[PDB]
Structure 1
Amino acid sequence: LIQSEEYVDLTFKLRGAPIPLDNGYLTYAALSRICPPLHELKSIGIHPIAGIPTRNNLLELTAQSRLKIRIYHQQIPLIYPYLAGQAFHIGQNFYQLDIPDYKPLISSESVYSRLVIIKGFQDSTNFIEAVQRQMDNLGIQGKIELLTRQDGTPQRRQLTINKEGKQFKVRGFGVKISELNPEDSLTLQEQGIGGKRKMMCGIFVPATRSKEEEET
């Protein structure tokens, strides 16, 4: 019920050809090529693109599909002229961004992260204690829950970094976090957890997306 200050969500309407469901390095590299200053930013995150799933491991862009960026509201003039109204290419297709809209950061008792990556922690228990430690660093208190598939197993995801000729394997979990209170909820939403924040993973969102991800 508390709208966070100093942090906003820059949302660009996204249109173009269908894209892989694991954009990650693809979208990040495209934006970095379009926006050189995006590489050197620190406290910025790119939202997972919202669109229905299509065949293979691709993702189809709808009219509601939009590129959303979480950024310090004073750092917008560093990337706005490079992104607002410009176009970026994923693979061989051209994608166009229009004038973005600002969305405030709302507090929620239960928050969700579709993907959380911590280096060197692959099992569930070590990952859980690592996220507890990360909460301890930021001084946030809450109960950690892991998103599960239809079989109840904790859900894992993989990030493919196509750096140079070799392709890289970075993997993590998707967690659901509640019992946060609005202040710590906003703190976790801005700060995020884990690494690879610009890599379309590690940021947070309300638990409605948690249930939606649980559905499929």
Structure 2
Amino acid sequence: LIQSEEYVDLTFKLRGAPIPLDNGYLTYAALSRICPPLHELKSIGIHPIAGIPTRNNLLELTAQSRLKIRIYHQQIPLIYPYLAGQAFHIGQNFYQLDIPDYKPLISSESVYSRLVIIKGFQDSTNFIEAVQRQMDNLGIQGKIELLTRQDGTPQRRQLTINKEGKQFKVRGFGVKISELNPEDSLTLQEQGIGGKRKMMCGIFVPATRSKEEEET
């Protein structure tokens, strides 16, 4: 019920060819090529693209699919002229961005993260204690829950970094966090958890997305 200040969500309407579901490095590299200043930013995160799943491991862009960027509101003039109205290419297809819209950062009792990556922690217990430690670093109190598939197993996801010729394997979990109160909820949403925040992972969304991801 509290709208966070100093942090907004720059949302660009996204359209183009069907896109891989594990975009990650693809989208980040395309934006970096379009926007050189995006590489050197620190407290910025890119939202997972919202669109229905298509065949293979691809993702199809809808009219409701939009590229959303979480950024300090004073740092917008550093990336706005490079992104607003410009076009970026993923592979061989051209994708166009229009004038973005600003969305305030709303507080929620229960927040959700698609994907949390912590270096060197692969098992569930070590991952959970690592996220507890990360909460302790930023002073947030809450209960950690892990998203589960239809079988109840904790969910794992993989991030593919195609740096140079070799391709890289970086993996993490998808958590659901509640019992946060609005102030700490906003603090967690702005700061995020884990690493690879610009890498389409580590950011937090309300728990409606948590249930939606739990569906499929």
State the TM-score, normalized to the length of structure 2: 1.00
Cα distance in 2, alignment partners of residues 106 and 205 from structure 1: 10
Partner-residue secondary structure (3-state), 2:141: coil
Q: Percent of aligned positions with the same letter in both sequences?
A: 100
**Cα deviation code 1:3-60 (max 9, x no counterpart):** 0000000000000000000000000000000000000000000000000000000000
C-alpha displacement of 1:108: 0.1
Number of aligned positions between the proteins: 216
Aligned partners of 2:136, 2:61: CA distance in 1, in Å?
38
TM-score by length of 1: 1.00
Q: Aligned equivalents of 1:49 and 1:65: distance in 2?
A: 6
Distance 1:114 1:160 in 2: 16
Work out the CA distance in 2 between the residues paired with 1:64 and 1:170: 29
Q: Measure, in 2, the Cα distance between the counterparts of 1:189 and 1:93.
A: 32
Which secondary structure does the structure 2 equivalent of 1:12 belong to?
Answer: strand
Name 1:158's counterpart in structure 2: 158
Aligned counterparts of 1:10 and 1:2: Cα–Cα separation in 2: 19
Shift, 1:111, TM fit:
0.1
Distance 1:30 1:72 in 2: 21
How far residue 99 of structure 1 moved from its aligned partner, in angstroms, is 0.1
What's the secondary structure of 1:116's corresponding residue? coil
Rounded to whole Å, the distance in 1 between the matches of 2:212 and 2:18 is 21
5+ residue gaps, structure 1: none
Offset at residue 125 of structure 1 (A): 0.1
Task: Give the Cα separation in 1 of the matches to 2:29 and 2:2.
Answer: 34
> What CA RMSD, in Å, does the superposition of the two structures yield over aligned residues?
0.1
Once the two structures are TM-superposed, the CA of residue 165 in structure 1 deviates from its matched residue by 0.1
Q: Distance in 2 between matches of 1:156 and 1:140?
A: 24
- The runs of 5 or more residues in structure 2 that have no matched partner are none
Q: Does 1:19 align with 2:32?
A: no
CA distance in 1: counterparts of 2:215 and 2:201, whole angstroms: 19
Deviation of the 1:174 alpha carbon: 0.1
Offset at 1:84? 0.1
Alignment deviations for residues 137-192 of structure 1 (CA, whole Å, 9 cap, x no partner): 00000000000000000000000000000000000000000000000000000000
CA shift, 1:116, in A, is 0.2
Q: Secondary structure at the match of 2:30?
A: helix
Runs of 4+ with deviation above 4 angstroms:
none
